[PDB]
Amino acid sequence: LSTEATAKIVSEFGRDANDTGSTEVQVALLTAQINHLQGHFAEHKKDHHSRRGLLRMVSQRRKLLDYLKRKDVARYTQLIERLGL
Amino acid sequence: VKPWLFLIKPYEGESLSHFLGRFRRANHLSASGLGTLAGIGAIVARWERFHFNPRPSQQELEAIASVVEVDAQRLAQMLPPAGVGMQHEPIRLCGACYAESPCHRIEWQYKSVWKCDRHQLKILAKCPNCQAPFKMPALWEDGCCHRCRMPFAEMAKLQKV
Amino acid sequence: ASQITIQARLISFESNRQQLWKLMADLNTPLINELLCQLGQHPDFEKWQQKGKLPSTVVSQLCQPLKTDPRFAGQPSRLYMSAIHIVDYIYKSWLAIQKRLQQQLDGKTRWLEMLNSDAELVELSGDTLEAIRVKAAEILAILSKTLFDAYQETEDIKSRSAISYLLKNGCKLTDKEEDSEKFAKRRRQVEIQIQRLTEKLISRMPKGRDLTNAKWLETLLTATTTVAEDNAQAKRWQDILLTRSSSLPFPLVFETNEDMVWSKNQKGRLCVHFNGLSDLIFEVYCGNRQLHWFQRFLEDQQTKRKSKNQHSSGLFTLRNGHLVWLEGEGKGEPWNLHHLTLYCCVDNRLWTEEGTEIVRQEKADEITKFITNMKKKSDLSDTQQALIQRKQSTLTRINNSFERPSQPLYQGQSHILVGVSLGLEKPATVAVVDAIANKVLAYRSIKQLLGDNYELLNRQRRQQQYLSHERHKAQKNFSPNQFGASELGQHIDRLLAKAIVALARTYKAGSIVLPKLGDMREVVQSEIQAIAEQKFPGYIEGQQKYAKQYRVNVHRWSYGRLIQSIQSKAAQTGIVIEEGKQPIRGSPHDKAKELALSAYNLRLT
RNA sequence: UAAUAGCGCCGCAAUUCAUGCUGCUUGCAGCCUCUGAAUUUUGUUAAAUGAGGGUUAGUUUGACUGUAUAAAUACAGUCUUGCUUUCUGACCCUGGUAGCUGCUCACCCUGAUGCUGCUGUCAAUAGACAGGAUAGGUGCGCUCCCAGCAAUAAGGGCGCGGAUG
Ligand SMILES: [Zn+2]
Ligand SMILES: [Zn+2]
């Protein structure tokens, strides 16, 4: 993921000026990477070395979503609606 | 005279890990040593870090019961009851419950527990002053954070209500 | 039974291959997939698993309504037959490797109940071990199947304990009242074998082949777009996403020899077209070593034609033929990348006229027995009478001999046997031994049989380690350069088989003896586990790293492949292969000598 | 500079045997000249192994008939097609240009079945140029050892931010 894209997605999932690493931001970064990767997996059906990375990103996002759900269901719902998961 | 050991009475809700650690520190034993004495090998060294990949069996607990002289049912009462899911990491602690009684509660390791029911405090997963994750319960020689030397009972007034 | 497969590439136009690829990859493999799935959820399925015999006609019954299906229509009948045959063979195998596994588990449970120590036998019987020993000797006076029958037959504690004492030593009376820890390890080993058989019995159902990979592509979208709710579902998504996207349609088994009609091209090249697809003409590209088989095929079909079908296709040198697609390296459409290949299964025994007579006698015996078996029933169905008619038709047509080469078979001296010893380190060692006078006529070693080729053996081991490392260094990089020395091992075992059969020919042997190895890679795994469970009491990783190299050497020790190669060559030559028991302790030469001697001793009755 | 030591493999020896050789004494006697088998026993000024990646519908191992031949086998004749593999050679290379994408790194410490290790020239940078399979170590290799790197083994330490159920 490009640095410009990460900065933009941090700002657009920001809760304040300095919130890099908030569960919302982490889920946003993972979702952006997975969305970019799904087309690559549509095309390159042999790139297993990216397949492992995709699996890892999916599991990471799942864990983050479960944690945010247990903590605050309201933030969880509004986040999952913002990303449409 | 009859063969004996420095017996330790189990607490209420203590972990198997913490109880075995107290038993070892009061007998100057080692995880390998305790396992060899019990007859189950290094499995004990696994239990001190909660890796229950093959749940502690009835035989592996009766063999311990023979050595630590605690009833096997009382031993199972420090493992999570059948079906209850626990997280082997991070090790979690409530300061107030430690001040009341210096032990590690197996109930703190449950996946479903985030609040101390008798203290209304959000239990701690890391040291509240230096963010140092807690060691395995068997490794608690005393109640203090290793990195910052802050007593466990003190942390009660840093942990949120 | 000396069936061997020859192969030849099939060359034709791009459209002639597009037709076949579309007609198999898009309609025949999906039919096989659906037939497998339906065979799985059949209500009688758990009944079949109890036996080893899937019913004769069930697969055709689930296929008759499937032929007219919108997505499985537009195929030749003899290709619906191919799909039926493939699925029937898959489930004829899958119900025979799970029934025998269940038998093994039952027998091992019975033996685990059998196993008692000297003290355990004393406490169960309530008598001194000496009385147990005396009664065990008495019962040995009155093989192991009989003792197991006696044990399962009686209920007395004393007699059953006597059976247990006998079978503990293996029908022997050993008076060494020692090694109780040995008994503990033996019971532990039997329990480990029980556990491993139980772990085996939970087997996957026959998968089938998914060329489109619709499930994979759908699951990728589900996993990326949505979020799982529990670990048990994300694990299933991960397992699906890592599956292997197979890209080769199933073969086409043509169980009738005549379904492949042969012809000669105007350029003299041999050509094939299959029943149901005659507009598709394939040109045979073989090698001259395999030319005589295909020329025999054309000559035999023409010979049957010229006699107005007075000749029984059924003595054809061709028995059946698979029509597979190999895998090509590169890109492009699948018909332009993968090479169509014909695998014809030929009964090598039919090449000579003399061997054709043997095949004729075999078929004329089995089919007249079939006629007698059907003649006892009084049902008298109409297609049953058609079958009866065909049987006598084959009887009549079998006595019309084609013109074939002549070779006076092989007169074998019954005395001279050949004993082959296999081992982890000495893959084979042969002893040509005369049985009348126990003196061995000859000995050979793994350097004598591989003469001028012995360098291969070391190069097999030197590089199968190397490749084993190279794979390991590429797996972590996820490169597809995983290579192994399977072809080298196959070549070496073929060389050994040729050398052994040639040696048997030179000394005019009358048989070849191979040991019955049984489950060899499992007994050693059980023993190593049992030993490591005391050597490492609670450390499972230690129990695994213990004797790791020995176990991987056993697992890659290809005794079965070598035995099969020697069996193929001996059948091709006429040597009557027998079986014996490899002595547990001894040098390879003595092992082979006593092995062949024991085989001769048992053969006499 | 270092590769010590271990392990596996070859060979070279030495010994004892025969499945060998000799002899008839035809199952015995000797011998190790060949062939092998089993040890141990060294790495010779050397014997044999030898693992950087690739390239041929490559050649040979083939079928039938007849002869000699009990047969193998040889010879002669007729036919020939390219499949799938194992070697031995010979030759080529040590890649480029584009994209798409994975992993790993605040900073330390230990150090993995971790990575790297050629010749020369120019530098002596960190890289080019030419060459190049002899390519760190031992006769040859290793996951072993040496050297450097080590975030991309694992473990431990540990700074500031955000999160902190
Ligand atoms: Zn509390
Ligand atoms: Zn602290």
Side-chain angles (χ1 to χ4, degrees), chain B residues 127-132 145-150 155:
Chain B
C127 180
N129 59 48
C130 67
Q131 283 77 14
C145 171
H146 67 273
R147 189 179 306 179
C148 75
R149 286 295 132 176
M150 157 153 301
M155 291 165 188

Side-chain angles (χ1 to χ4, degrees), chain B residues 131-152:
Chain B
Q131 283 77 14
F134 301 148
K135 295 285 193 10
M136 303 307 120
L139 213 63
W140 290 357
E141 149 87 336
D142 77 286
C144 62
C145 171
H146 67 273
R147 189 179 306 179
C148 75
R149 286 295 132 176
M150 157 153 301
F152 272 174

Side-chain angles (χ1 to χ4, degrees), chain B residues 1-12:
Chain B
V1 80
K2 174 182 310 322
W4 69 277
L5 287 131
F6 275 108
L7 257 45
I8 300 296
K9 97 168 291 293
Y11 278 12
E12 310 83 351

Side-chain angles (χ1 to χ4, degrees), chain C residues 7 269-270 288 290 426 443 448 455 462 469 589:
Chain C
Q7 42 182 292
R269 190 156 258 152
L270 268 159
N288 169 48
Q290 272 86 36
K426 257 91 179 192
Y443 280 144
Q448 291 214 259
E455 161 51 17
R462 184 188 64 258
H469 201 57
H589 285 259

